[PDB]
Write a protein that binds this ligand. Structure first.
Ligand code: HEM
Ligand code: HEM
Ligand SMILES: Nc1cccc(C[C@H]2CNC[C@H]2OCCNCCc2cccc(F)c2)n1
Ligand SMILES: Nc1cccc(C[C@H]2CNC[C@H]2OCCNCCc2cccc(F)c2)n1
Ligand SMILES: C[C@H](O)[C@H](O)[C@H]1CNc2nc(N)[nH]c(=O)c2N1
Ligand SMILES: C[C@H](O)[C@H](O)[C@H]1CNc2nc(N)[nH]c(=O)c2N1
Ligand SMILES: [Zn+2]
Lengths: 411, 407
């Protein structure tokens, strides 16, 4: 079977066969599309097929399908599963696996980069202090004094689900949020609940607008422990504008390293619940979402005030005007400080080239349009005009519940 | 079976049950989402008729009344005898309002119950269609104080006697290829513009020539007509800050009037049902003006603003985009032609969703189309989960007539 996608701007038509290898469900049916819904302990029984499918994929990728090495590995994994109820990946399979989870991540516009990922194997880690050390090394490596390098650190896999490794932070580097008695918020309102947990755990909060949060780290199902990332490891960029000299006086900054730490990595049926990964920013993530969402820093008004835009009617488009200015500021600031960043034009244009190459070499590229299209200037990026097919391939990154919701506290 | 949608900005959770009434297919499966694909007998008719009549009689609080059971038997006799049936005027109006109400891709649905329905089922010729259409254009335009309207031509019978408007919209601009390799006017309309030429239209060959109507009655060959220019309200585009903007020579028309869709009510098919509302500014400023395959004006505008066009990261495209859209809204407002900005329209749609959830149990919505083509996340719809499903009565796409028509 063959499915076609059309770019309505170029008339380029692509043919997808890769979707045939998808088994996991989308949330949609013949009667309902759930394409805009954000969120739509394995037996031995279910494990061996998952391992077999993965190893078949791995051995095919290295051009050794059906080889003696391939067959011996299947047998070895089979034996290990029946005897121990799980199995261990070879370093080569882990690296392949992690890269492919990124390749398969339908919500990621940056996947042109997928084959360049530094994988840190942290499966020998046993304690929270051990995790802290691994994470510091990742942050220093990935940061590279502003010449950002993509990286992932992989902690031990789930065993019985009672001994999970988890990074409780949603990202390795994020700013604290504090709810004031008067109902206003200081700092990042997205991080209020998490900030509150850190405080309870014993963090001494500076109570400012951009306090880098401590790491809250859980090894082997134990209660999580707090650690402060050395400040010299946390690269930050003060935000200024190339023409507007008052922009610096907004007192804005952001961190250079975007590093997702709350997702679950699935490889061959194995579950890695702590697998922090990092790339580099696309400008709109900060300038559009972090700064201008109503439920985030919410700076549109203050910026438009300072620009002296007509604010009495939405139809002056003051908000759109201030939006572009803030996003120019973000890109200018990062580039001036030599911290890697990509603008949404460049990133989407690269994504289209990647997607086309993937169709040609792989038979497809699963992509979630709702997430791929940037949150400003949608239709002046080429992805807006690109039909996309969204389906789930493994290896994969998945959401998992917040750990404060599920953790059994030991004391 | 009961489905929740969350707004991530407000935490408001709504519960959808209306989807369970849905019947037609989405294009998606459990294995694949097709959310971003643009185009994903007497025996058949009686169930469709019944489903419709049932919802009509329920809507007037007469479900299962003697009047309800009388109508179902009368329609059933009519289908049994004629293989089709005729809608009462009340049914037709209800059907048309509900097709709009059900249009998952339309952000302007807060207005759905204020629709003027022009019954043109007595029409027989292209001159007659032309008359109905001029009357629709003049009524809807209302000297710039636009009113929503639909004109409904006779329903499909055996399918070789279709009424069709060949135009995609009642009012559009011509497109011309030259030796240049370039396109003058609207590249979207090149093929149609050429069909007009081959059928006899003498073209001014300019950038903004209002196209003629090409009208097909009763499956006959279509005929050309020029809409009286005094009936076509157009707006010159100027900027409230940039005096040079006027010299780009830009204008647009005031009346958005889709004329190529098919209205289905109670299984009956209305292949010619032009309808019109009023513009959201982005349709013109972002899409018509800035799509690479449309007027594609970003380069010329950026140049007049003297921006640094050497690198994408200066956001010269994005700056110019905003200015073009400011000009569109300013021009329509100044000339007193109804228009809505994307902020106002999307705020209205959120309120409409809330009304629909509370009063109807849901609102089918296609997020990919509802979120505006600029500044997505600063509009509330970006943060609103939506469920997309097909309800009837409906507006549907149909084949372009030129590919289908037997000459
Ligand atoms: C190299 C530069 C990269 C860029 C510019 C980039 C860009 C993005 C953006 C803009 C998003 C959507 C974020 C949001 O709106 O919340 C995203 C999502 C995502 N990316 Fe990337 N990415 C990069 C590298 C990576 C890497 C290294 C990985 C993992 C190895 C990754 C995996 C993912 C995943 C799993 C998502 C989904 C996150 C979610 O659903 O919350 N990306 N990417
Ligand atoms: C009153 C003001 C209205 C506004 C502001 C409005 C807004 C819009 C917009 C922005 C679109 C997307 C157009 C595109 O991107 O191609 C759309 C699509 C649509 N609207 Fe409306 N609308 C209005 C009135 C109407 C009326 C009166 C009807 C029918 C009675 C209608 C039915 C539809 C349908 C069926 C579509 C999908 C068209 C397609 O798929 O090409 N709308 N609407
Ligand atoms: N440029 C890069 C590189 C790597 C990773 C990234 C994503 C990061 C950065 N900027 C946002 C964050 O992405 C992680 C947060 N994404 C939303 C998670 C979420 C919330 C609610 C519901 C739901 F389904 C999902 N960007
Ligand atoms: N404001 C209003 C009021 C009523 C109606 C409208 C839509 C009109 C105006 N502005 C665009 C036009 O909409 C009709 C064209 N829509 C896209 C048609 C299309 C083409 C290719 C593939 C595909 F799937 C669909 N706006
Ligand atoms: C409701 C809707 O699906 C939700 O707001 C999505 C839309 N698209 C997105 N796209 C990206 N990249 N990131 C997001 O957080 C979202 N949010
Ligand atoms: C491929 C993609 O579905 C296509 O470009 C869509 C996206 N969203 C849209 N949204 C609206 N309102 N109108 C459109 O024409 C489109 N085009
Ligand atoms: Zn879907």
């Amino acid at each position: 079977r063959f499915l076609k996608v059309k770019n309505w701007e170029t008339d380029v038509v692509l043919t997808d066969t890769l979707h045939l290898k998808s088994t996991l469900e989308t949330g949609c049916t013949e009667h309902i599309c759930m394409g805009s819904i954000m969120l739509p302990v394995r037996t031995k029984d279910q494990l061996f097929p998952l391992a077999k499918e993965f190893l078949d994929q791995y051995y095919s990728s290295i051009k050794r399908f059906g080889s003696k090495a391939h067959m011996d590995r299947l047998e070895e994994v089979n034996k290990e599963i029946e005897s121990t109820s799980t199995y261990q990946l070879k370093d080569t399979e882990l690296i392949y696996g992690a890269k492919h989870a990124w390749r398969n991540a339908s919500r990621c516009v940056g996947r042109i980069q997928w084959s360049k990922l530094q994988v840190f194997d942290a499966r020998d880690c046993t304690t929270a202090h051990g995790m802290f050390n691994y994470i510091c090394n990742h942050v220093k490596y990935a940061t590279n004094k502003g010449n950002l390098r993509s990286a992932i650190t992989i902690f031990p896999q789930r065993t019985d689900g009672k001994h999970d490794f988890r990074v409780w932070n949603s990202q390795l580097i994020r700013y604290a949020g504090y709810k004031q008695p008067d109902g206003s918020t200081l700092g990042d309102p997205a991080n209020v609940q998490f900030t509150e947990i850190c405080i309870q755990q014993g963090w001494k909060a500076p109570r400012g607008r951009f306090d880098v949060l401590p790491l809250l780290l859980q090894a082997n199902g134990n209660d999580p422990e707090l650690f402060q990332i050395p400040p010299e490891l946390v690269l930050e960029v003060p935000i200024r504008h190339p023409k507007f000299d008052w922009f610096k006086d907004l007192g804005l900054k952001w961190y250079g390293l975007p590093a997702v730490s709350n997702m679950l990595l699935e490889i061959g049926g194995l579950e890695f619940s702590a697998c922090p990964f990092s790339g580099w920013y696309m400008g709109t993530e900060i300038g559009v979402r972090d700064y201008c969402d109503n439920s985030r820093y919410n700076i549109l008004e203050e910026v438009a005030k300072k620009m002296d835009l007509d604010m009495r009617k939405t139809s002056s488009l003051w908000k759109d005007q201030a939006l572009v200015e803030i996003n120019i500021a973000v890109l200018y600031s990062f580039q001036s400080d030599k911290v890697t960043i990509v603008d949404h034009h460049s990133a989407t244009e690269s994504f289209i080239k990647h997607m086309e190459n993937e169709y040609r070499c792989r038979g497809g590229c699963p992509a979630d349009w709702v997430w791929i299209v940037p949150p400003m200037s949608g239709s002046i990026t080429p992805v807006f005009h690109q039909e996309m097919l969204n389906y789930r391939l493994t290896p994969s990154f998945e959401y998992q519940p917040d750990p404060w919701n599920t953790h059994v506290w030991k004391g």
